[PDB]
Structures are given as structure tokens and as C-alpha cells.
Design a protein around this ligand. Sequence first.
Ligand code: GDP
Ligand code: ADP
Ligand code: 5GP
Lengths: 203, 198
Amino acid sequence: ARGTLYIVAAPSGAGKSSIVNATLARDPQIALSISFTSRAMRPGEVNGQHYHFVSAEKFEQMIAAGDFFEHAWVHGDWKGTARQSVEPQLAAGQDVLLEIDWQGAQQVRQLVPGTVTVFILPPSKQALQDRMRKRGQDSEAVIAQRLGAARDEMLHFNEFDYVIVNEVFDTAVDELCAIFTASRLRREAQKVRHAGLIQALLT
Amino acid sequence: ARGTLYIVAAPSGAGKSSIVNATLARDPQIALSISFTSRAMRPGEVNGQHYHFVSAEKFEQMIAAGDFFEHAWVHGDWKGTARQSVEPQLAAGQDVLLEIDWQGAQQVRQLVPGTVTVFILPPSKQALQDRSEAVIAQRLGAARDEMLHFNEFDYVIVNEVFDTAVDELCAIFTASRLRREAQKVRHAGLIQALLTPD
Ligand SMILES: Nc1nc2c(ncn2[C@@H]2O[C@H](COP(=O)(O)OP(=O)(O)O)[C@@H](O)[C@H]2O)c(=O)[nH]1
Ligand SMILES: Nc1ncnc2c1ncn2[C@@H]1O[C@H](COP(=O)(O)OP(=O)(O)O)[C@@H](O)[C@H]1O
Ligand SMILES: Nc1nc2c(ncn2[C@@H]2O[C@H](COP(=O)(O)O)[C@@H](O)[C@H]2O)c(=O)[nH]1
């Protein structure tokens, strides 16, 4: 039986990376996908861990070769999910979580129906920019650019099945765990999981 | 924000009552609905505890008056959920859980936006038969007949480990409140603020 595809989206600084890492730590049957990008590395990022960093020319070569399940132009740079990160794992029964923008999520919904998509919101407009300040060493000029990019991302929240407002971190983790647990209890997933038991009960 | 309508259905002997009771103890935002029935009270029964017991004439009067949100002929007696048991709590923001049969579950799915329906299965056929040989055969047959409608429900829980079954039902309640359309109402002002420029 094929694995389930999960998408968690949020503007940067809403805390999706930290919530997802705590959730997958608690729910290890979902594997995290490492995206490719052509944007430059930020301090604290490690190539091969947080992203597969490539040049813009290399990313575009990979586009032409069909290497990407989805890809999109995000904040002036390429971001993308390689086919090797999704299609083989889903066919092998591995659940996969993608952390992508709304453009990539729209492409994925067209390719894989049944994807479970979640959007994470900050608890206030001020809380968003406060979290950007605490995280990086970004100049106030960069922070202003990211906030404008954050509103652009949040304008597409309505495309997602679930919405989490990340006020209390531990609560947001519980709530994402609840969504992942609930998705395994959906009728069609349980029919596969318990085909023999159900066959026995109804005969 | 309006409350959610939840339906938990199961054949007898799946352990549904204990799972629902344990969930309500953990989640005080969930009100349990007391159904009306025309079945005769058995000795020792308390009206208003498990059911609102009425006469067959009174139940049918209530059917005629449109008093029932859903109602059905269940195992030879009338069963139904009155609107006064759900509509006020739903409007006040309290979630309401219904313990009804599949006939009632079908009616509610048609009526109310957001209704979440959950079907609970026993972990094996032998586990059910453990929970008059002709009466036992009748009871298993009513159990099989109810399980034939599991495919009409949004979620399925197999009650193998009790504590896991309660967690899973709680997870379903939590997840349902995070659905987009509920959260847009709940955080309407927040979303307007986040999407408005400087
Ligand atoms: N449609 C409907 N079915 C109900 C309602 N209340 C209970 N039932 C169903 O009636 C069946 C018998 O209920 P139960 O209390 O276990 O048995 P009883 O004590 O002999 O009536 C179960 O399958 C319940 O799901 C109700 O309000 N509406
Ligand atoms: N609920 C929260 N309350 C306060 N700070 C939070 C909360 N969630 C995350 N943070 C912090 O906000 C910043 C955003 O971190 P991160 O998860 O990487 O955000 P994103 O991946 O959305 O860019 C981090 O400094 C993180 O520790
Ligand atoms: N389309 C797409 N967007 C991605 C991918 N990986 C990360 N993103 C998104 O790009 C945005 C910017 O991330 P950042 O540049 O801050 O790491 C975030 O919304 C993030 O989720 C990917 O593989 N595809």
C-alpha cells in the first residue's frame, strides 16, 4: 500500500521547521524530504542537511532533465523537491512530509490527490517579525523584505486542509501530531490496514 | 465559533461506551447527547440517565412536530435525537457527540456541515463473540448488520488497546477543530490582520 504525502507550509518565522522537527521526532513513520535550492546559504545552514544547495545553472539543468517532482521560484530563487525524494518512498509504503511553498503545494495536489496539507500561522503580525529577529542575524532591511514575503505566502492559506496558529509551541506540536494520527484513521487507510479483520467481521 | 457535531457508532461489544466515556472525561469541550426512545424502561432504569424515555405516542407526536434532528426505528423501538439536545450547544461553541445507529448517522451527514462520523470495530470476530444460543446468534447478527455500514463513516478505530483507542478518538476531535473552515471563523480577525499590508 502506498505511503501518504504530507505538506506543511508556513511563512518563514512562523515556526514550522521547529514544530515539524518535534512532530517527526514523536511520529517517526513520516520521513522528511530535503529540498534543492539555488539560493545562497544563510549562517547556521549546512549543505546536505537543511537543503541540497546548488547553483542556479545546476538547478535549471535538473529542471530540464525532469529531476523535480515539484519546483518553484520562491523569493527570487529556485526551490524544488527531487523525484527521488517522493515517488520511490511513496511506492515503497513510506510516508513523506514536504515543507514547500503554496506554488509547490498546488503542483503536488495536481500530481497526488489525497495529500494532507497543513498551514501554520503566527499568533499575530508582530509575533512573526519578533521571531525573525530572534532567529537570524538578518539586517532590519532583510527582515522587512521577509515580512512582505510572509504576507504574500499567507494570502494562500485557504488552499490547505488544516490551519495551526502557533501560539504555544508545545500545543502546535500536539495539534500537528493529532492531524497525522487522524489521517491514519481515515476510512480508506483503515480499510487497507485491516482488510483481513474487516473481511472476517462481515462474512 | 460554532461547535462540531460528532457521531461515534459501533456494534455492541466493541467497547464503544467505555471509549466514549473516557474521551469525554479527557475533553470537557464535548457534550454527550441524551437520546429519546419509546422502548419500555427495564426495571431499575433511570429516565434521563442513558435515555429520555417516552411513550410510543409521545415519540410519534415529536416526530410529527419536527422535534427530532434525526430519528430512526432501531431494533423494534423508536430512537431519536432532539434538536433541543444539539442545536443550543452547537450554537454556543460546545461540541456535541451523538451515539446513534447508522440510520441516524446518515441523516446527520446530510443535515449539518462539519459532521465527523467515527466507526469503532472490535479487534477480532472472536473478541465480539466473547462480549440462549438463539439470542446470542441474534445479537451477533445485529452486530454484523451494523458493521456492514462502516464504509459510510469518515474514520475507523479498531479497539485493540484501550488507551490507544481513546488517544485516537481524541486525535480525531483535535484534528477536526483544526480544519480550515472552522479555523477561518475562529481566527477571522487574526487572518484579516495578517493579510492586510502596512
Ligand atoms: N438513530 C438513533 N439510534 C440511536 C440513538 N440512541 C441510540 N441509538 C442506537 O440504538 C442501538 C441500541 O442502543 P443501546 O442503548 O445499546 O441498547 P438498549 O439499551 O437496548 O436500547 C445502538 O446501535 C445505538 O447506536 C438515537 O438517538 N438515534
Ligand atoms: N510558538 C512559538 N513561540 C515562540 N517562539 C517560537 C514559537 N515557535 C517557534 N518559535 C521560534 O521562532 C523562530 C522560528 O523558527 P523556525 O521553526 O525555524 O521558523 P520557520 O521554519 O517558520 O522559519 C525560532 O527562533 C523558533 O524557536
Ligand atoms: N516550492 C518549494 N518551496 C520550498 C521547498 N523547500 C522549501 N520551500 C519553501 O520556500 C520558502 C522559503 O524558505 P527559506 O528560503 O526561508 O528556506 C518556505 O516557505 C519554504 O517552505 C521546496 O522543495 N519547494
